[PDB]
Subunit: 388 residues, 4 copies
């Protein structure tokens, strides 16, 4: 109909309720389920779907051997109905590539897929299911993007890209698209030292992205974008409650404008909802691996360098594998406020479970409730032994 | 379009004709069919669908081992086209949970799924395929609901929930929802001592639910609800024709306001159409197990404590397995009256057939006819030996 | 939109062109294809679909053992897209039963399925995908119907049913339905001695059905129906070109009002287009078994007892299996006339191919052309040896 | 809505970006994927789909043995969603045959399938999914057509057919269809000596087809059609950059009106975009087999007999198999010009990979970009060893 505008603020988050779960690996043991990774969720005005980068093979198929690798000519951004598994028969291909983002602006959906060799990659922007704009690599070192949904406001959908070294200073740009065309692009500004895989959401005409400093920070960089002025700034979450992985143990005081040191050249896509006292951070439970997952209410995490948790909810037990996590919201739901949601990728297979030769995942997603609901843990559920 | 109103009365039921049958287990022996249980049928203004709680695995898949268990993080309410089997590829997920109910109010559908640990469960009410309201457990002991469709009148859809002991007094509440929001809730009233798994239908602006007294009654409790005043009352079916299972043999006189004693702490979801002389009761043939199924016309069963059958129809022979049964009607069918329908869950596998490690079911459903049609028996049809 | 009216006459048939073919058995050797029999084709105003009675199991599934039997609780009328195979995932169930007919009246579709024991069967008439009317068996001996599409004119859709002995005089009735309700029914009139499995078509407000005399005739009975007056008459095709199977060899002169003797108690559903000189008969090539299939232009076959072929076209070689055949036409195609079409069931498995334990079929259908096209043979194509 | 008119010219082609890829053979190793060959892509006003001639069997099915053969009664033109693989469950059958073409005129789609014995074949033209016109073979020697999409302008869709010898002079005709009916047909004119498998596109009310001279030319014949006047002419691409296969090595000067000699009786369907300096030719890298694939910018290739490449892009490495290639464009995309696209069939199996008994393919397609994007190679990706 008309372009959507971020006119509401976030609802109060007192707990999280189960939204969707596909049980992909359990079902895939005996169904034609595609091997995937880097999943996310994104809504249209009339439907919310699951998205992920397919590996171009089923889990039980012999071509699943080697799916631990991130980039190949056989990957594609696919979407499928909420809570169904990604099957060969119900999946829709959005575009071909090994890195992506996608969002509905209210009238139609923009999907972006990046493909190519590490030194000669290119992004092609699709709008209304047709290719419209193409961008060639600027730093010649793995042009890459969000791996979760972008957000739009009055037709303008900013997207964060990074090109260059994953273990040093790189060239990050914020592109402002409207109907698939580039309106403008900026180099990263602010105090964030390295940006990767931004997870974003929007409220009251402002877009907040929580990203990943793969180089030196264990605290997460945050990019605030103004989609009307088409500007942005960046900093780190001040809180001592560290949310990257691997990471050091939590200190008593965090850092607001510098990476908090302790682990170098590694991390995991994650997210947060930063809204004053109504602030919730998500993180793996293990400081060493992508294991477990919890949500912690940390009032004023963004600006308070001594902020600690006042409430929490365990999503995945530390004895179960987790992985990437990102934010999304159904901007077209009825109501006075936007209900915060997120998904967690539950990775199975390599590298942790090496008895099988593949790497895949299932998804679990929750949304906020103003009630204080009881909690349950939501693991992948598959028994690796059945695949041997 | 507009909210549906229960403006008609029930058609005369002189017999039952076959409506739908999926042959799920026969087909599942060699197709990607999901393991299910607790099925039911529910109609929209333009389509009637099959519904059930999936176990998050196919029958032939290795994860089917252990599906005798009722609650896990891998269950979900799924719907699929009438008479098709519940396959991995044609099933739509309504919500995540191990107990549910769902109904169309005329404008859109409300689905409710309950999930969680036994002591910290929560129900989330979805309306128009988006979560809207959440209710946390009040007695901390398996919050649970109908396991069959709810009914609405002018936008108000009452739903019966029970929380607490399954073998003693528990806390049952009737919630009145409108567009997914709670308008009001009441504690159970009347003479019913224990309520579980209510099967409901509506006619002439009144909703009748036949439930299950798991604690002490072999006669069934009935809840009559007035969706305009938003009140209700409860009693037991007076008839000596006992319809729970397991149960004692039929006596000569029943009880109207007390459970009829003989079997404790057990039962089976069932239903009835209570309409003066046009009254039909459904029950398993066996008094000992979920075996066989018949429909008996018992004039004035609700109020006549000596009422006995004047006609009947066998649905499933006593040599074949049955299971849960519930009511539904297509409130949007053309005509002067509402045609009564019901479904029977045909359970296969554990605990009765222990050569296999799974438990699943297929469905058979019939609707009433004003004609006196010939009868046939409708068993599941699968040969367990083929799964060994 | 509005009820369709048979306002056109048949186009000139100078040859037949390939219309649809599903290759069901070839594909089913390694896909989830349902075992079927008694197929046909029927069109809606915007789509033509394949129809058949499913056996409630896939070909490769173990439950396919025994599918030679015609009646069970596991059969159902299913439809699927033109030229696709009948798979577990793309098939839609119209109704439950072991005998059927179905037709679109222009506004919506009526499907009729008969089920039950041999002595207590009943037909339930569905209209707009809801059950509307039910008819109980009148002679208590396998109530049965067309096994191909019915035809409607201004809302009235006559259907021919037979109940009683298959090897002696039986009770055949013509029911005139309108929006699923019975307007009237007549006992069979005319000179036909036994009626079964009528194949019908309509043109210029008249409906012609070519049926099967299972008792004593090798020539086919024809029923002409007037859907406005709601009357009919019957006779036999006069031509000496005999079209039932098994049958005697063709004589020099046929019979117009009596069965032509030679074979008793057996036959095969077949059809014909009777239109003066524009008359074409279809028949198996073999006089002994359901083997081969050809179309022969026999001018005035209906009324000329010495009429012989002036042209022909081989559809299936005598070295390949055929089976049932029936007529259908797309009454909603653009044009000045109705293009005649037909389908042939290509049966594989038992009883002729006894190395396998199942019986199934694939379909081939053609439509007429005013051109004189070259011919090709269209066999099922599967190699039975691959199923052993 | 209304008939589409070729009102735009081609966009500037500075490089090619990835458009779609199905990974059919990789996925088919463990999914119900149909064996195909002769694929192409064609768009409707709201969707672009993949098309191909099915072999009527899955790759893993036993009936795949022998799929190296081009013509049988089991082939059919099927279409399926962009970038999905051609599965038994998501494929739609357009028509039955072993040679085809298809195009949307703006209001609806015309599909043409040819079937029959080599000496008695016939084409049936379908329009709006109904058969409308039929054409019988005129030279009695494999009536055949494009094997890629046709193009329409104001309702007129020319299609090039060839009938007769594949290794000598044959009878090629250009048929001008409008709403499925023949408006007119012409014998081939101009200097092209032999025409087969034309790949066409349209811009500024002119249709250009690049075909294949199977008899004596290694340079490609070009047919220019005027769909308003309904006339055409033909010549050969002048350039010394030879694009058929097998072929001689490139000379220094080509031939404009004669086949360039060197290889007889063989070739491969191919295409080109001829637009002055904005001219790009596609060809296999190997001069000996259907191996590798590249696009070369050869300014004025059509008219300049000494024209050589000024830029290029490798699509498939010479160590990977290619096969047929053709043109298509989304004439309904937004924009000031038409974006040129093409697909390449990646054949696997026989005759080159003889360890398996089948022959199938996957597809890769690209579209032009005005940017100078980095290149990547896009091979089929399947490992034949997994099928043994
Ligand atoms: C039914 O359902 C309800 C609803 O879910 C259940 O109630 C919930 O129960 C939760 C489980 O306890 C509870 O969650 C915790 O909340 C704590 C906050 O509560 C207290 O908050 C303030 C401040 O303390 C108080 O004023 C208030 O009264 C509360 O007591 C959190 O602090 C908890 O998180 C911490 O503990 C968990 C482990 O239990 C850690 O995994 C988590 O990471 C937090 O601890 C680490 O981090 C902090 C801060 O840096 C450190 O101080 C601490 O040392 C830990 O650090 C180590 O570990 C981390 C992670 O590995 C590592 O990185 C670091 O380096 C260190 O090694 C927890 O989130 C819910 O709030 C509560 N909800 C409600 C509404 O009540 C109920 O139990 C269920 N019912 C039944 C019958 O089961
Ligand atoms: C073609 O189709 C038609 C249509 O289906 C067929 O006709 C139908 O045939 C049915 C089969 O007989 C018949 O159904 C029965 O109806 C009886 C009522 O009929 C009589 O009703 C009144 C009162 O008796 C008469 O006035 C009237 O004339 C009729 O005679 C029912 O009573 C039957 O139900 C009882 O029997 C069945 C077993 O046959 C039990 O399973 C059932 O539960 C009922 O009996 C138990 O319960 C009663 C009441 O408590 C007890 O009195 C009795 O002792 C039994 O109790 C034991 O068993 C139960 C269950 O296990 C257990 O809980 C308890 O503790 C005890 O152990 C039956 O329903 C249809 O009415 C009839 N339909 C029509 C329209 O005619 C026809 O046959 C078919 N044609 C052919 C050729 O086959
Ligand atoms: C390219 O394509 C074109 C188009 O398809 C091909 O041309 C077609 O070729 C067909 C094959 O010959 C031909 O079909 C035949 O037509 C005959 C009629 O043609 C003659 O008609 C009249 C009258 O004779 C002539 O005036 C006229 O000039 C023609 O000559 C039919 O008579 C043929 O049918 C009979 O033969 C076939 C076997 O060939 C039988 O299977 C069929 O059943 C008919 O014969 C039986 O029945 C008759 C009548 O009762 C008996 O008289 C006869 O003895 C047979 O009876 C025995 O067998 C039956 C069946 O088993 C059994 O029940 C009975 O008891 C007996 O045992 C045949 O239909 C097309 O007309 C022709 N089409 C056109 C437009 O030309 C062309 O060949 C192809 N090109 C190439 C290069 O291949
Ligand atoms: C990141 O991405 C970018 C974008 O893709 C990459 O840059 C591209 O790099 C390409 C790879 O080199 C390059 O493609 C080549 O372009 C040549 C034209 O460039 C020159 O053009 C003119 C004229 O020479 C110059 O004025 C200008 O400065 C350029 O130098 C083509 O000539 C190339 O094609 C020829 O070479 C390839 C093999 O490399 C052959 O396969 C191809 O067929 C051409 O050569 C055959 O045919 C010609 C003409 O007949 C013959 O002269 C020649 O002898 C060859 O003939 C033999 O082989 C053929 C085929 O087997 C056989 O039939 C015949 O009989 C003979 O046996 C090639 O197309 C892109 O233009 C360039 N793009 C851009 C925008 O720059 C970049 O590298 C990537 N970055 C990184 C870090 O990798
Ligand atoms: C968003 O705001 C623009 C004006 O700024 C308006 O035209 C548009 O309709 C608004 N969107 C909606 C959904 O109201
Ligand atoms: C997978 O591939 C590796 C490396 O190519 C090989 O050694 C291994 O055995 C393969 N695993 C399986 C199950 O085939
Ligand atoms: C149900 O009744 C309400 C008024 O009470 C009315 O507004 C509504 O339209 C009625 N529903 C229908 C389907 O008529
Ligand atoms: C199922 O699980 C049980 C208990 O975990 C195990 O003993 C049994 O063998 C399993 N059955 C099968 C068929 O694997
Ligand atoms: C069929 O005829 C009836 C009148 O007899 C008419 O009302 C109806 O519209 C006609 N159908 C069509 C499709 O014109
Ligand atoms: C099919 O069933 C028969 C009879 O029940 C049995 O003897 C036969 O072996 C079965 N065939 C197969 C392949 O199981
Ligand atoms: C194509 O041109 C014809 C007139 O020549 C016009 O009627 C038609 O609408 C045009 N098509 C479009 C899409 O404008
Ligand atoms: C395929 O068919 C050929 C020829 O009919 C036969 O020799 C060969 O063994 C078959 N291949 C396989 C794998 O069955
Ligand atoms: Ca880090
Ligand atoms: Ca009880
Ligand atoms: Ca007969
Ligand atoms: Ca050539």
């Amino acid at each position: 109909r008309d372009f959507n505008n971020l006119t509401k603020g976030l609802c109060t988050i007192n707990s999280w309720h189960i939204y969707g779960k596909d049980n992909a690996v359990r079902i895939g043991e005996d169904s034609d389920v595609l091997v995937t990774r880097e999943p996310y969720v994104s809504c249209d005005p009339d439907e919310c779907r699951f998205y992920a980068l397919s590996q171009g093979t089923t889990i039980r198929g012999k071509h699943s051997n080697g799916t631990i690798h991130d980039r190949s000519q056989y990957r594609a951004l696919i979407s499928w109905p909420l809570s169904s598994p990604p099957t060969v028969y119900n999946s829709r291909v959005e575009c071909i590539g090994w890195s992506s983002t996608s969002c509905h602006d209210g009238k139609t959906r923009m999907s972006i897929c990046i493909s190519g060799p590490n030194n000669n990659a290119s992004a092609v922007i699709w709008y209304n299911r047709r290719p419209v704009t193409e961008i060639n690599t600027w730093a010649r070192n793995i042009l890459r993007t969000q791996e979760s949904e972008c957000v739009c406001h009055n037709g303008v959908c900013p997207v964060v890209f990074t090109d260059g070294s994953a273990t040093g200073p790189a060239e990050t740009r914020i592109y402002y698209f409207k109907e698939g065309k580039i309106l403008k692009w900026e180099p990263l500004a602010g105090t964030a030292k390295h940006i990767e895989e931004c997870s974003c959401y929007g409220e009251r005409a402002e877009i907040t992205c929580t990203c990943r400093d793969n180089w030196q920070g264990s605290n997460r960089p945050v990019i605030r974008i103004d989609p009307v002025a088409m500007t942005h700034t960046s900093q780190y979450i001040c809180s001592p409650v560290l949310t990257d992985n691997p990471r050091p143990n939590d200190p008593t005081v965090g850092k607001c404008n510098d990476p908090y040191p302790g682990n170098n050249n590694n991390g995991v896509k994650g997210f947060s909802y930063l809204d004053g006292v109504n602030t919730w951070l998500g993180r793996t439970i293990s400081i060493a691996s992508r294991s477990g997952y919890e949500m912690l209410k940390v009032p004023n995490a963004l600006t308070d360098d001594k902020s600690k948790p006042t409430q929490g909810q365990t999503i995945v037990l530390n004895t179960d594998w987790s992985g990437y996590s990102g934010s999304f919201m159904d901007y077209w739901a009825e109501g006075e406020c936007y209900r915060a949601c997120f998904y967690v990728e539950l990775i199975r297979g390599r590298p942790k479970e090496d008895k099988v030769w593949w790497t895949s995942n299932s998804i679990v997603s929750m949304c906020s409730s103003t009630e204080f609901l009881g909690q349950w843990d939501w693991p992948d559920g598959a028994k690796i032994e059945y695949f041997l």
